[PDB]
Amino acid sequence: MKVAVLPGDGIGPEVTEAALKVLRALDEAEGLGLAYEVFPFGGAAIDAFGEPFPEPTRKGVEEAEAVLLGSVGGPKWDGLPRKIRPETGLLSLRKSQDLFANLRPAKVFPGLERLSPLKEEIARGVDVLIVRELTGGIYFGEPRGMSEAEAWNTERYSKPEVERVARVAFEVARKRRKHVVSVDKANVLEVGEFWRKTVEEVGRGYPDVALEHQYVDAMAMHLVRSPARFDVVVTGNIFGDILSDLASVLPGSLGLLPSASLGRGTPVFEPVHGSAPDIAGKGIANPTAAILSAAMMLEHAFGLVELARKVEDAVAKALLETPPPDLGGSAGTEAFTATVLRHLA
Amino acid sequence: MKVAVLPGDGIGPEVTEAALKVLRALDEAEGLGLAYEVFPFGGAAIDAFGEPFPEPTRKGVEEAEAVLLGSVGGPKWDGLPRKIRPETGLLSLRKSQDLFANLRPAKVFPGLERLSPLKEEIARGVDVLIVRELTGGIYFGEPRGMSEAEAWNTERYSKPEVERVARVAFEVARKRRKHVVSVDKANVLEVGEFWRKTVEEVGRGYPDVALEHQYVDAMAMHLVRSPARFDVVVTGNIFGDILSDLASVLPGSLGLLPSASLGRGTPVFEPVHGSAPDIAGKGIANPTAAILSAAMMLEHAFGLVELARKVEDAVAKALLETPPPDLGGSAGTEAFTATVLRHLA
């Protein structure tokens, strides 16, 4: 497996290496034929090359089968022209690979229910994966405009945009508990009915996955009341943006969340947390999200579901055994990784 | 105070009378000059007059200063032409009075934190009031359409639509903790920036109320993480529909929720719960939402904030002392009301 590693800024290098320590361990034990190369990206790239997504890195991403991304950005590059900012480089990466689906999982690991803002009885067993359409919807729809008297924006979707995001939700579900819930606003909106109609049609080719439809307002209530009853949720851009953020707060810690973006090109896997420059080089940075991103990579980029689950079980145990600082513990980056590896046998 | 009472269907008559028992008690003790008349509405009206919102009732609502509404609808009238359905009558009522703002409070009464899906530490102290714009936005915006290839809907807002809903949020806030949070999607959408711009301008006339802006996706997270830090929240139609439903689940019981709709005409106050025909005439129906609707009426229709708060404190105590069936208790409608009245002295 050819992996392009883009450590990035702040704690990026540290947490990314921790994930590689896990990947190399699996490679030794299973002979995955792991081949990777680290390329400059983000702030580190601006300071070295003048741009956040330099040519060699662009080629590297094209050459790879997956991208393991660290953290990007920082105060140091916040005051630069948009065209060359770290954040912009992320946009360029996604666009170059035509990634149209954003996978955003929220899971409450056993024993960590205490960290959830929900009562332990309801937080228990949560393992939902939100699939959000990234390229269309009201965020890009036209017409759009503003005047002194009014403002307008258009929520527009064509059949192919809905079909493609829907297909990844079904493929993702096949690797999980085979249940998808498509979220729309069909009882009021034309696009809502169009969306539902298309997803029901696309579903016909996936007889092994159960399809369910839900209204966005109702889904918001279910995520707080009975979040444990879902598996895969697929929805539009703005709805997915809201629902994934809502689902984010369920585990009670942003540091634990991994994320992925799938599409036509090389898939990208990255931790949801920022670079946290203030603690760069001290150890201490929680590598959970980076390691879990590595697991997402095995599952979605290579289909190694059995292995991804093994890595996931290992970190679950590591969180209880040697909790990192952000979880009221003292286990630094290396200590935590050692425990993960300890359970990967 | 001239009040038009529309008991409605199912448990409507029972719960509405319980609220009147509270209003009459206050009227005796304070000399409110309460004057009310009950008019046929909803299902009861269809069976008696052939339509859910008959002429005498329309006139009655116009003649009144406020409308105390019970429950409406039922399986018996579900299979009728839309034009004459109970639900349609509600639409006609709102339209006839040009009510453009929907007040939707969610409160976790002290001692009832156990009922919340949130941990008791965070459920404690929640008292948020969502003000939702009812007449505009994507639900009514044009253009809108659907074809075999695509579908579209328009989120459009004119300055006067934003200005008016914003003013009620400020007036409502003045009666509460004087803090408003306007929710938009300004960092991405034109209408979002237009909305924020207008609400900041309108706010200048209300120096005694603190104004804050929040993004809808962020607000979703705050409502689950730190819901106790808000007072009044004002937002658009679709955003308000989602956020009010989300906020609804916080107290852990739909039966406790009251609601109001303000605008140019006679304001309407009604419990959020349905008619629950199956238990009509048995007693047992929880009158909390109806009594709390009566309190909302005193506050918003007559400005009797001090009295509304007194009624609210009474029910709070009643819920702990003589819990109704739906809260794991045995107190029927009358028993519960008696306790409320007991504390209204």
Distance from first to last alpha carbon of chain A: 21 Å
Which CATH class of chain A? Alpha Beta
Tell me what portion of residues of chain A adopts beta-strand conformation.
Answer: 15-25%
Quaternary structure type: homodimer
The total number of structural domains of chain A is 1
Total count of helical runs of at least 4 residues of chain A = 12
Got a strand count of chain A?
12
Describe this structure in words.
Two copies of one chain form a homodimer. Chain A is an alpha/beta fold and 345 residues long. Chain A contains twelve helices and twelve strands. Chain A has one domain: 3-Layer(aba) Sandwich (Isopropylmalate Dehydrogenase), CATH 3.40.718.10. In chain A, the strands form two sheets. Chain A has a ten-stranded mixed beta sheet with strand order 2-1-3-12-11-4-5-10-8-9, sandwiched between helices. The radius of gyration of chain A is 20 Å and the shape is globular. Chain A starts with a strand and ends with a helix. The interface between A and B is large, with 47 and 47 residues. Chains A, B: Homodimer. Chains A, B: Substrate binds at residues 94, 104, 132, 217. Chains A, B: Pathway: Amino-acid biosynthesis; L-leucine biosynthesis; L-leucine from 3-methyl-2-oxobutanoate: step 3/4.
